[PDB]
Amino acid sequence: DPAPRLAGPPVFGGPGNDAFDLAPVRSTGREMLRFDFPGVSIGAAHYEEGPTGATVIHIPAGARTAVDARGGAVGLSGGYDFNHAICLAGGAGYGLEAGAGVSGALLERLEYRTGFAELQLVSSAVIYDFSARSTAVYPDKALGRAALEFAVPGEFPQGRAGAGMSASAGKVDWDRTEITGQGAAFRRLGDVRILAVVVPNPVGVIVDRAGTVVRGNYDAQTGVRRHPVFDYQEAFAEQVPPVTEAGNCTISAIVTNVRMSPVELNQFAKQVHSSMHRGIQPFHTDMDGDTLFAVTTDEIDLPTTRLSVNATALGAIASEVMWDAVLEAGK
Amino acid sequence: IAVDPAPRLAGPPVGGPGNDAFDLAPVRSTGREMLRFDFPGVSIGAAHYEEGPTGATVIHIPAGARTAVDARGGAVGLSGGYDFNHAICLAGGAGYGLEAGAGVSGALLERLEYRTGFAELQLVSSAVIYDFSARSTAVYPDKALGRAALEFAVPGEFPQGRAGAGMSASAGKVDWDRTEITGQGAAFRRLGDVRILAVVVPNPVGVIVDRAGTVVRGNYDAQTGVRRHPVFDYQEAFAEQVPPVTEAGNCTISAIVTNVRMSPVELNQFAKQVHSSMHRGIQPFHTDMDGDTLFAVTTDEIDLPTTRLSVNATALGAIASEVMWDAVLEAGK
Ligand code: NA
Ligand code: NA
Ligand code: NA
């Protein structure tokens, strides 16, 4: 209601990358979102051997980017203010290797030109998905390259796909952790386009607009999911240590076509990222490594007439698109 | 430090091949000279590809060590940037060279028998220099080169000069005709039980300056036989009402490692102080044309005696600032 997807407790000491001839698989997930956003392509690939994967947002023209990183365990490479691709992956910090696969592939496509203005810029972020499985396989260069090679315009594989293969929510106790997925949502308003992509691996739980906990912290003894604050407040009431496992974060992107200055884009990124504490609770905690990329293709000038009404209004809309994406990941 | 007055002009950059065009064998970098130091628990390895030429330098601290990162300028190239690290990987190849850190990470995971508990994660922070203007290939530090640098790590040794990440580092990017090859550099001091190690790979837009204020590496004008401070070029452009010129692809990546226990707040303040101090030896510094990144690392081994603001961090910062200037001068020598 929704049915549980308990991850079960991890088994450590399983086989790693060296044990397999790892075969990239194109991730299709549970269903395909289709959208109209020329110049923005998405690819997703996984290793069944994990299972673990990578999701690549490819913007071949390059696009201005703001990064908003929060919590105590961020796993980020590049974090550039201009990107040709964003690579999201499992495997904790080891999975940043997938982004090197994307960077090297883009250098090849550029016929190995290395002038400073031709540098192919990939920002990468990762989730700790080793809790959700019993292997040590992680996204490697080959998997990042595969995700890029599978990238097509206007498609996103919802659910257990790419970086979302082994994403999970609700880390108060691993016995109550549930598999999430990745999610995406898209809106067009006049000529304005907003795409949200998210891979929620939070310490917290996914919450819908009614306040219902819909994924994470499921107790098989009760058949019910609980907001973590109730666990935490009873630990403090009982004067016992609260418990929670490390290895959490949400990694996300907003892509829009609206021209924004560097200041507007950074403020927009912060607003949208804070808004995600509506659908993920708690969020931005010391136990999380939350990283949001806000990307603009700089195509549309909004009509007007030092503080940006347009960034605030766009931020409010983009916040709703992102909440929709979080709910798709949890579905 | 007897800096060689002779010029080492890089020359103008050149359609060259990339990594898989070559059968790349890592070479253990020995540089011009070995620094020997006494700091158990800290090892340095340096590897290069002749075909670049380009390389990587890895500082390996297997215990793990608390770290503060201080990043400045408009072109920083960083991976991880963790507050706790088992290794720091410094490399050429611009952002492509961040791959070398993935090689270090994967090797450390193999050494840990593929254990993946959160507390057992092997944490590598990586930073890069743009060294493509100093050569004629697209070769960059890859996983194999990072792994090789880690495998070459020797306790208590550092190869000075054109070695590891320093192989194609360069200074003075007002005009590529006046750019000179630098190198990497290290210096070490022991004071009572305090140990301070500085490592630097200067690829600055600016020039290396000695304690007398002499420009000793970068911005060498072969028409005059002397190096001058970039400010002279910039002020002449503005006085002439013509655009100043300067090439992109600059930064200095560095580490300061000490055994003195510091809180996260002290360590971050220490990092900022030491990094700012490097504007003495590198000028200009922390510019929008640079991607300057300093890692300040404590191995948390000794408590300094005491008598909300840290005198110990300030005093240690002053001494570490001198060790780092010495390291910059060894890179430029
Ligand atoms: Na797509
Ligand atoms: Na050493
Ligand atoms: Na220690």
UniProtKB/Swiss-Prot annotation, chain A:
Phenotypic consequence of G93S: Decreases thermostability by about 10 degrees Celsius
Active site per the UniProt annotation: C249 (nucleophile)
Highest taxon of source: Bacteria
Post-translational modification: Expressed as an inactive precursor that is cleaved autocatalytically at Asn266/Thr267 to generate an active enzyme composed of an alpha subunit and a beta subunit.
Annotated effect of mutating L119A: Decreases thermostability by about 10 degrees Celsius
An example molecular function term from Gene Ontology annotations: aminopeptidase activity
Ranges in coiled-coil conformation: none
Pfam families for the chain: Peptidase_S58 (PF03576)
Pathway the protein contributes to: Xenobiotic degradation; nylon-6 oligomer degradation
CDD domains xrefs: DmpA_OAT
EC numbers for this chain: 3.5.1.117
pH-related activity note: Optimum pH is 6.5-7.5.
Gene Ontology biological process terms from the UniProt entry: nylon catabolic process
Family indicated by similarity: Belongs to the peptidase S58 family.
Complex formation: Heterotetramer composed of 4 alpha/beta heterodimers. Exists at the monomer/dimer/trimer equilibrium in aqueous solution.
Function summary: Involved in the degradation of nylon-6 oligomers. Degrades cyclic and linear oligomers of 6-aminohexanoate (Ahx) with a degree of polymerization greater than three by an endo-type mode. Cannot use Ahx cyclic dimer or the Ahx linear dimer.
Name the UniProt record assigns to this protein: 6-aminohexanoate-oligomer endohydrolase
From Swiss-Prot, chain B:
Reported modifications of this chain: Expressed as an inactive precursor that is cleaved autocatalytically at Asn266/Thr267 to generate an active enzyme composed of an alpha subunit and a beta subunit.
GO function terms (MF aspect): aminopeptidase activity
GO terms classed as biological process: nylon catabolic process
Cystine crosslinks: none
Keyword flag Hydrolase: yes
Active-site residues, Swiss-Prot/TrEMBL: C251
Pathway: Xenobiotic degradation; nylon-6 oligomer degradation
Gene3D superfamilies named in the record: L-amino peptidase D-ALA esterase/amidase
One matching Pfam family: Peptidase_S58
The EC number(s) this enzyme carries: 3.5.1.117
Record keywords: Hydrolase, Nylon degradation, Plasmid
Cited SUPFAM superfamilies: DmpA/ArgJ-like
Enzyme class label: hydrolase
Catalytic activity as recorded in UniProt: [N-(6-aminohexanoyl)]n + H2O = [N-(6-aminohexanoyl)]n-x + [N-(6-aminohexanoyl)]x
Lineage top rank: taxon: Bacteria
UniProt pH dependence: Optimum pH is 6.5-7.5.
Role according to the record: Involved in the degradation of nylon-6 oligomers. Degrades cyclic and linear oligomers of 6-aminohexanoate (Ahx) with a degree of polymerization greater than three by an endo-type mode. Cannot use Ahx cyclic dimer or the Ahx linear dimer.
Quaternary assembly: Heterotetramer composed of 4 alpha/beta heterodimers. Exists at the monomer/dimer/trimer equilibrium in aqueous solution.
Family note: Belongs to the peptidase S58 family.
Protein name in the entry: 6-aminohexanoate-oligomer endohydrolase
Gene: nylC
